[PDB]
Design a protein around this ligand. Structure first.
Ligand SMILES: [Mg+2]
Ligand SMILES: [Zn+2]
Ligand SMILES: [Zn+2]
Lengths: 49, 84, 49, 47, 140, 436, 263, 97, 147, 133, 66, 113
RNA sequence: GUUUUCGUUGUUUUUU
């Protein structure tokens, strides 16, 4: 439980290869992104957004 | 006794990637908390680009504190570190 | 099944031996822990009653 | 909302002519499940 | 018959042909032994069909004598994990897991014993037109 | 979770720091994780059924830290042996091998399309190598277009000349391919490589975009050429097998003479190695020589067009002895560092007489996969394969144990502002990290 | 400039000599016919009840795989276009099949003939199940045994093969040109020689075999192509050819219309 | 000369033998006779000999630190439970091992 | 049937695949890389003889230790008016162009495997945890949190 | 504008492993000791041994993004029948009179052994190689 | 288990010919010969029916619950 | 479960145009055309016809990624001709060539029967 | 009206 542990905001699936993808890039299934979320402050630069 | 005088800051004048990133993240979080911005924001709505800009301009108002293995700390100002 | 146990890695048991000639499937075997120990009747092996 | 849990079918749109059921109707917008596809889609109330 | 221990004290003819002492040069075939160190042979038994030393899964591979043994073992293990037709009464049986190919095909290249295994009768795959090529770098 | 957002990237087992990275989100439909094919090398994985793991940041300081530290380009070079870890691989690698073939010519509009395939293109089309009669471009030209400017490279392959009579050797100036056929030794993960120098000079971003454009153009050209393989690639002409058979006969004669030597109490004893053990060593050396000469003759027979030969030359997959065993001869069987033993009393199989020692009589394979394997040699190969798989299964676990123990051994050590190497307790290990 | 010379034509197939045109254009037109031909296939399969031994979705899928007489598919609107609530006869067609096996022994082999055009945007000659012959029951659909009834009601809708391969009107469409590799667009693999190891193209007659000493002309270009326009039966190879041409033409007209409108 | 079995002190002084370059494959005898640092030298030598026997290379500094770490106290700290746990470091670590 | 596991990279439409002079497109494409690495000679023999039978209309025995020569199969195929080694010219489907090489092309028996893609997809942001440790629960079936 | 000119009889032609391109050896019939090696596409310009070939080099053919050659425009190449664009990658300052000028035409190499004055003008970067017939 | 409606590869409708193909089989006409009769040239087509396995009858063999 | 819709392969969304223009500042009289709901069928066809034009300096298209019904092309017509006019010229040229072949095929099918 | 929950421990199997 102390070194290793189950952690939220973590996903697992099969890998895929793509020449049309950047080295640092990665192809993310859309449903995963919708499922996952990033807490983010309400700032003026994005308030309308 | 705890700090080290400004003159004997024997540490390199460059900024470690460690401290560099710590500074960048700290500044980005600060601005994201509506902190006043020491540089201008044109369209860089995201905090992190603003933080990187303020760093390149060396306009980040923070001071390092480098704890030596002996335990003593020396304090380096963000503006004086040699950004590489 | 080989009820020898996994205590002690060793190589003799999991290793194939000439004396399975025509007795167990030489190629089929489990992977990892079960590899080399569990066996299978060859297509012409017959068991005495 | 008691206008849910009932058979509903589409009159116009990209999936015109598909049966479905209503699950969530937070407000002024209806989300519907479909039978042939194992998916649930939004759609305005009027379609 | 012969058990493991009985196998040792006997001399078998690995083929029906090998019983008769033979007397050519084909580059598309395996190579048989020389067998010249002993001018005299007293054979005792013969191999009905040596390819019967396999397992049920192992025998499904075509020409397994042309690939690496580990590959054969892998195919043997995995074949038990490909979906297909295993029973006829599936519909009546209430099972937690059951998956069936719509159109199982008896493989074009089929071994002999498969008749005994009904695999042609109970196939678990399809024969598909294939190309061995690098098309869009997505086949890697 | 919006696109381009930095996120973590973790695969197992995590042997070394390159086993994990952080990436920029690019959401697409379908339910698999899509990876630029170069990333695989440090991940040492293929699409044979491999999963993946990821973690998403929930704060900005974390997001900045990832972006600035775990950025994949930052880790292009490997301190492991202070060299690049990734490299151009597989379809791209073998394809680029063929792009750089001297008699490589490209049509105008085709060149136009590839040039458009580079998002890092200058917008300035190069002149063709030939202008009369028909304007044509060489793949070297497009490759140079991909490369950034101000780049330089040379490599003298085997003491060659500047004229490169073999088309071997390599030279780049200002990122312009001067000559040579690109290979793993050039664009692999080896040290000093083109990729390495690009990293060193043009920093991370340029070297990563280099990989991206390389994939783009290489794969596009290949597509518009295609590449395949056929069974015929693994079969030689009759005279070649004749020579192979003569060599095999000579080697077996050598072994038989060694047998007549040892049996009459005439074979000399090796230092610290018994007459039986000397005999075994001599036999093994003879069989190795036999298979080596045979595979060498076969390879020599091969035509350059052979997809197998093209492939070994490209080296993105395959090796010489692969050809040797595929076509010429699998060769001698080895078990625990020895031949096939007498699992039956005084013989390995009931189908052989007692007390035989001919190469085949103790585990020599003369055939190849194309020739098929007789049951005895099949079984010896199967024994070897079972042994090897067992050894792999044992080694992976034992090595994992060793790695765990070691990492526990040195989990706290650090370099410090003083430059010393001290532990959590502060006891200095090295007076200077690497003395440097 | 474009030329046509039918070598062999048929209801299902049209095999012609297309020359004096571009390789790219020929490929594009082939793609147009194969994928860009709207057609009509069983889409909305609906079971009032069933008793057969096969999965309802399996039967539905096999039903979609049924080519339907699609002569007037050009005329009927897409279902999406039509503004009527639900479908109407002008935006979809109604067929029905309802087969039962009676008798404790035997097996009633349901056939596509059992599918019947209940409705459809008349008098459009559409929704008619395609058959090799009138006596040809058609494709075997289902086998009903003792006390096995089948009642179903389906709705088909006009669509394109791009949307789903069931709409593919052409069973297959080959292609070639320059069978002698005069343009040398391919490198011929071999061990001794490509010539004695490679067969000869069926269209090889249309082009002479290049002379031994003839010097290569790098101005040689793909001019004469070879074609056979198969149809799965829902439409005629000539109708398929013409309709694919018309679809390409309409796409180009729309593209230029956008060119003028956006400006 | 390459010998089977190791008897460091006895052989080194043998006539006809380079006592100044005599080497043992066993670093334990190096510590016994040639103290700590030469023991570390033979240690690393054999380590790399095994590691690079394949020809594969690893950056020196890492192996240097490794051999250094296990020579810190001046004697052999064998990599097992006893030596590492015998370390005077924080209990929370040594126990965790 | 030769340990050649593979997952679906991507699907191409009928037009999208490259096509033979006969118009035949492959059902699936594979990486030439594996063959030299894996030495699946029996795989090539299988595809060849499969094409031979399909052309000839029969089912061939695949029993090993059988002297069926690949050269004999080549004789039969060349008799069938086909490239003895299964090479076939193939065309870019996207442009219709010839492809500069010729393609080993044919049928082969293949097998779908239980480990379907969605069998494994899983995510977790917040939900069930172990009461004993208040930590994310285990198991994809049970909202497992990545260890 | 010809930075160099000479006519060469092909001593040997070498396809070697390559087929579309042949490596050739020729000596300037005008002057011996001018050893020229060149790489040229067999098919696009076939040749054979002992072929006397005019050889000429000019830095510019105008009598930067490349564009299809308008037939309206003329060029020194209009007189020639096989033309390459190349780059000067080694202008050797060798022996007393052995100056080896090596030019790469995007992969096509060439060895030019000869007098310095014969090659003194050829200390350039991008040279067009011009061959008659 | 039943005949496919079309040829996977090209999409040629094939189900109808099955009964006819089976009839051709009844008289032991050679596989290749019968295939030729059906005007099924492309082995992309020939393959399925050449190795198509039909087992719906085994389901009919089972006494249906009704 | 994340797979995109099949019917959208040809349906253009209302908010987006079928075509999108963008001038290429990096070189003179060069534009960039962003494409939607189109593939090699139209792309290569238009590209070849245009490439046959003499008044074009550059032209090239590519599909960014197969999963998306949208690709791009970078045209540059020489100074006199702005790219858009050569594009519509190629459109009309292919229109007339296709109509010619259409009437020809009508004639040949009519006569053959 | 906001709000709001399913078990363990084992076993065996494979998944790399
Ligand atoms: Mg795996
Ligand atoms: Zn309507
Ligand atoms: Zn077909």
């Amino acid at each position: 439980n102390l070194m290793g542990k189950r952690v939220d905001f973590s996903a697992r699936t099969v890998i895929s290869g793509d020449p049309n993808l950047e080295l640092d890039q990665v192809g993310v299934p859309i449903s995963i992104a919708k499922t996952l979320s990033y807490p983010e402050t309400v700032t003026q630069y994005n308030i309308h957004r | 006794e705890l700090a080290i005088l400004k003159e004997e800051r024997t540490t390199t004048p460059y900024l470690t990637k460690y401290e560099r990133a710590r500074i960048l993240g700290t500044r980005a979080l600060q601005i994201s908390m509506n902190a006043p911005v020491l540089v201008d924001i044109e369209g860089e709505t995201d905090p992190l680009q603003i933080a990187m800009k303020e760093l390149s301009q060396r306009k980040i108002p923070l001071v390092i504190r480098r704890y030596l293995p002996d335990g003593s700390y020396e304090d380096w100002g963000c503006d004086e570190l040699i950004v590489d | 099944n080989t009820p020898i146990g996994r205590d002690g890695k060793l190589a003799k048991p999991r290793q194939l031996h000439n004396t399975h000639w025509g007795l167990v499937c030489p190629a089929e075997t489990p992977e990892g822990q079960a590899c080399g120990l569990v066996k299978n009747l060859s297509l012409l092996s017959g068991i005495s009653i | 909302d008691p206008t849910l849990n009932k058979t509903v079918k589409i009159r116009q749109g990209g999936y015109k002519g598909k049966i479905g059921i209503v699950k969530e109707a937070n407000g002024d917008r209806f989300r519907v499940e479909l039978h042939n596809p194992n998916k649930t889609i939004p759609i305005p109330c009027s379609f | 018959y012969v058990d493991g221990e009985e196998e040792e004290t006997i001399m078998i003819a690995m083929t029906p042909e090998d019983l008769q002492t033979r007397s050519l040069n084909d580059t598309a075939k395996r190579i048989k032994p020389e067998m010249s160190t002993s001018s005299h042979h007293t054979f005792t038994h013969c191999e009905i069909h040596p390819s019967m030393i396999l397992g049920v899964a192992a025998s499904i591979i075509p020409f397994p004598d042309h690939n690496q043994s580990p590959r054969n073992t892998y195919q043997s293990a995995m074949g038990k994990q490909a979906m297909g037709v295993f029973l006829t009464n599936y519909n009546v049986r209430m099972d937690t897991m059951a998956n069936i190919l719509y159109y199982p095909q008896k493989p074009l290249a089929k071994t002999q014993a498969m008749e005994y295994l009904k695999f042609r009768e109970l196939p678990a795959g399809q024969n598909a037109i294939v190309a061995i090529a690098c098309y869009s770098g997505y086949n890697q | 979770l919006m696109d381009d957002d930095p996120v973590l990237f973790n695969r197992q087992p995590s042997l070394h720091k390159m086993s994990m990275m952080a990436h920029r989100v690019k959401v697409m439909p379908y339910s698999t994780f899509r990876l630029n094919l170069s990333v695989t090398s440090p991940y040492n994985a293929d699409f044979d059924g491999d999963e993946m793991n990821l973690h998403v940041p929930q704060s900005e300081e974390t997001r900045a830290e990832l972006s600035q530290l775990c950025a994949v380009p930052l880790q292009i070079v490997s301190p492991q042996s202070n060299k690049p870890v990734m490299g151009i691989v597989q379809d791209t690698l073998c394809g680029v091998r063929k792009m750089t073939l001297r008699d490589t010519f490209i049509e105008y509009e085709q060149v136009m399309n590839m040039l458009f395939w580079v998002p890092s293109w200058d917008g300035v089309v190069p002149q063709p190598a030939i202008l009369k009669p028909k304007p044509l471009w060489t793949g070297k030209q497009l490759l140079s277009i991909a490369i950034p400017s101000g780049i330089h490279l040379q490599r003298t392959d085997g003491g060659n000349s500047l004229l490169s009579p073999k088309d071997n050797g390599m030279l780049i100036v200002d990122g312009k391919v001067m000559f040579g056929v690109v290979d793993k030794k050039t664009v692999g993960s080896g040290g000093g490589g083109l990729i390495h120098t690009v990293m060193r000079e043009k920093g991370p971003k340029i070297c990563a975009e280099l990989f991206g454009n390389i994939q783009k153009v290489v794969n596009y050209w290949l597509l518009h050429n295609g590449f395949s393989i056929g069974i015929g690639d693994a079969i030689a002409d009759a005279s070649t097998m004749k020579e192979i058979t003569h060599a095999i006969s000579s080697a077996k004669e050598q072994v038989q003479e060694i047998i007549y030597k040892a049996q009459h109490n005439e074979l000399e004893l090796k230092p610290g190695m018994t007459l039986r053990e000397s005999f075994e060593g001599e036999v093994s050396r003879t069989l190795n020589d036999a298979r080596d000469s045979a595979g060498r003759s076969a390879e020599m027979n091969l035509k350059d067009l052979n997809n197998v030969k093209q492939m070994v030359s490209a080296g993105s997959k395959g090796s010489f002895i692969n050809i040797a065993q595929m076509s010429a001869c699998v060769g001698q069987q080895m078990v625990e560092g020895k031949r096939i033993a007498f699992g039956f009393a005084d013989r390995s199989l009931p189908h052989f007489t007692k007390d035989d020692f001919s190469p085949e009589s103790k585990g020599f394979v003369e055939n190849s996969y194309l020739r098929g394997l007789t049951p005895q040699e099949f079984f010896f190969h199967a024994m070897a394969g079972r042994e090897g798989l067992i050894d792999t299964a044992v080694k992976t676990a034992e090595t994992g144990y060793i790695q765990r123990r070691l990492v526990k051994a040195l989990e706290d050590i650090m370099v410090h502002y003083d430059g010393t190497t001290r532990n959590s307790l502060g006891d200095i290990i090295q007076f200077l990290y690497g003395e440097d | 400039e474009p030329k046509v010379n039918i070598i062999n034509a048929q209801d299902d197939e049209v095999e012609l000599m297309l020359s004096d045109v571009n390789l790219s254009l020929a490929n594009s037109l082939r793609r147009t016919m194969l994928a860009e031909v709207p057609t009509l296939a069983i889409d909305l399969v609906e079971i009032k009840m069933n008793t057969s031994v096969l999965a309802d979705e399996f039967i539905s899928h096999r039903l979609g795989l049924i080519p339907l007489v699609s002569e007037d598919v050009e005329e009927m609107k897409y279902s999406r276009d039509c503004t009527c609530e639900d479908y109407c006869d002008e935006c979809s067609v109604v067929l029905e099949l309802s087969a039962r096996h009676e008798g404790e022994e035997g097996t009633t082999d349901v056939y596509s003939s059992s599918l019947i055009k209940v409705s459809g945007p008349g008098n459009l000659n559409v929704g008619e199940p395609v058959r090799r012959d009138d006596y040809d029951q058609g494709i075997l659909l289902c086998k009903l045994r003792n006390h096995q009834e089948l009642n179903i009601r389906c709705i088909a809708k006009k669509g394109i093969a791009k949307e789903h391969a069931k709409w593919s009107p052409c069973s297959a469409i080959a292609f070639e040109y320059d069978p002698h590799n005069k343009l040398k667009h391919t490198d011929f693999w071999f061990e001794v020689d490509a010539k004695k190891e490679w067969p000869d193209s069926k269209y090889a007659t249309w082009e002479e075999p290049p002379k031994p000493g003839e010097v290569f002309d790098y101005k040689a270009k793909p001019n004469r192509f070879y074609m056979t326009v198969e149809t799965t039966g829902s439409l005629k190879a000539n109708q398929v050819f013409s309709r694919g041409i018309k679809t390409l033409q309409e796409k180009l007209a729309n593209v230029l219309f956008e060119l003028e409108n956006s400006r | 000369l390459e010998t089977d079995g190791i008897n460091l002190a006895e052989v080194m002084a043998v006539p006809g033998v380079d006592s100044s370059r005599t080497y043992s494959n066993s670093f334990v005898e190096i510590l016994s006779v040639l103290g700590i640092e030469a023991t570390r030298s033979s240690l690393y030598k054999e380590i790399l000999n095994v590691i690079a026997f394949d020809g594969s290379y690893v950056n020196y500094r890492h192996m240097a630190l490794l051999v250094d770490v296990m020579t810190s106290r001046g004697y052999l700290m064998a990599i097992t439970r006893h030596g590492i746990n015998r370390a005077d470091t924080g209990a929370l670590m040594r126990c965790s091992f | 049937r030769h340990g050649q596991k593979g997952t679906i990279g991507v699907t191409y439409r009928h037009e999208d695949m490259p096509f033979s002079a006969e118009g035949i497109v492959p059902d699936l494409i594979i990486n030439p890389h594996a063959i030299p690495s894996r030495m699946t000679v029996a795989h090539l023999i299988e595809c060849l003889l499969s094409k031979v039978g399909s052309i000839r209309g029969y089912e061939g025995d695949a029993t090993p230790f059988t002297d069926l020569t690949v050269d004999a199969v080549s004789n039969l195929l060349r008799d069938n008016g086909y490239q003895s080694r299964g090479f076939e010219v193939m065309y870019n489907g996207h442009t219709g162009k010839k492809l500069m090489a010729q393609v080993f092309f044919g049928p082969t028996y293949y097998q779908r495997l239980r480990h379907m893609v969605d069998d494994k997809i899983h995510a977790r942001a917040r939900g069930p945890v172990q009461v004993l440790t208040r930590q994310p629960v285990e198991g994809r079936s049970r909202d497992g949190g990545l260890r | 504008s010809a930075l160099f000119d000479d006519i060469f009889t092909v001593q040997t032609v070498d396809n070697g492993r390559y087929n579309k391109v042949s490596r050739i050896i020729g000596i300037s019939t005008t002057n011996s000791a001018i050893k020229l090696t060149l790489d040229i596409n067999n098919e696009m310009f076939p040749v054979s041994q002992d072929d006397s070939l005019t050889v000429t080099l000019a830095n510019s053919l105008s009598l930067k993004s490349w564009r299809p050659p308008k037939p309206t425009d003329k060029s020194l190449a209009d007189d020639y029948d096989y033309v390459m664009f190349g780059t000067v990658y080694k202008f050797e300052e060798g022996d007393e009179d052995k100056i080896k000028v090596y030019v790469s035409f995007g992969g096509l190499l060439m060895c030019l052994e000869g007098g310095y004055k014969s090659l003194a003008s050829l200390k350039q970067d991008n040279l067009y190689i011009l061959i008659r017939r | 288990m039943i005949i496919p409606v079309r040829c996977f590869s090209c999409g040629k409708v094939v189900g109808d010919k099955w009964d006819a193909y089976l009839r051709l089989l009844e008289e032991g006409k050679q596989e290749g010969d019968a295939l030729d009769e059906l005007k099924l040239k492309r082995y992309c087509c020939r393959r399925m029916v050449l190795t198509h396995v039909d087992l719906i009858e085994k389901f009919l063999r089972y006494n249906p619950l009704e | 479960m994340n797979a995109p819709d099949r019917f959208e392969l040809f349906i253009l969304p209302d908010d987006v145009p079928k075509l999108k223009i963008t001038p290429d500042s990096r070189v003179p009289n060069c534009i960039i055309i962003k494409f939607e709901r189109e593939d090699h069928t139209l792309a290569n066809l238009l590209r070849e016809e245009l490439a046959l034009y003499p008044d074009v300096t550059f032209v090239a298209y590519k599909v960014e990624h197969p999963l998306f019904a949208n690709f791009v092309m970078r045209l540059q017509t020489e100074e006199g001709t702005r790219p858009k006019q050569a594009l519509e010229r190629a459109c009309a040229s292919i229109i007339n060539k296709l109509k010619t072949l259409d009437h020809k095929f009508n004639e040949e099918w009519n006569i053959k029967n």
